[PDB]
Amino acid sequence: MVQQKVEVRLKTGLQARPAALFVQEANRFTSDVFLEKDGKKVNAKSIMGLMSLAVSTGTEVTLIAQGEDEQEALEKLAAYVQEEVLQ
Amino acid sequence: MVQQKVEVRLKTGLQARPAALFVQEANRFTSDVFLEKDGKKVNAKSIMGLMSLAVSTGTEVTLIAQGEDEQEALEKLAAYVQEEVL
């Protein structure tokens, strides 16, 4: 057996469970909702879309909502992404 | 429309493609391979296992290889994980 400590330089993104829950919450709104970082935009109502964005825990991203319930969508989703929960 | 910058506090891990390619590379060897962080060890020839480790780009993890070709497996996978070109 041999071991070595290495630095992960491969791309990371949201894990499956957190992404699935994000989508469940985002689907409650009629607004289009996107997550954006470095000019790349993904659909927040898509599990595979959310997991395609390169992000690390602690990274800053832009949450965008457009539609009739955009304020409510932004409030609920910003809380979710930041591990907060408003209720 | 409205927007707001937020900090991602949700858990992250290797993306699907890099995880799948790591396994393709590991499949080249007969050795069993594992990745370990913070007491959590996963089978590195399992894509789901690989992706279940909480990691961020830049994080340090321990790569473990055991088998007949363990030394060569370790070298080649260490280079892959660190994105080093030969």
From Swiss-Prot, chain A:
The keyword Cytoplasm is assigned to this record: no
Quaternary structure (record): Mixture of monomers and homodimers. Interacts with CcpA as a monomer.
Other known facts: Not phosphorylated by PEP and by enzyme I.
NCBIfam families: PRK13782.1, PTS_HPr_family
Disulphide bridges, residue numbers: none
UniProt record similarity statement: Belongs to the HPr family.
Keyword terms, alphabetized: Phosphoprotein
Species: Bacillus subtilis (strain 168)
PROSITE patterns recorded: PTS_HPR_DOM, PTS_HPR_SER
Record PTM Phosphoserine, positions in chain: S46
Name listed for the protein in its UniProt record: HPr-like protein Crh
Biological process terms in GO annotation: phosphoenolpyruvate-dependent sugar phosphotransferase system
Pfam family, one: PTS-HPr
Outcome, altering Q15H: Cannot fulfill its catalytic role within PTS transport. Does not affect dimerization
Record domain HPr: where: 1-85
UniProt-listed InterPro entries: HPr (IPR050399), HPr-like (IPR000032), HPr-like_sf (IPR035895), PTS_HPr_Ser_P_site (IPR002114)
CDD domains, sorted: PTS-HPr_like
Function: Along with seryl-phosphorylated HPr, phosphorylated Crh is implicated in carbon catabolite repression (CCR) of levanase, inositol dehydrogenase, and beta-xylosidase. Exerts its effect on CCR by interacting with CcpA.
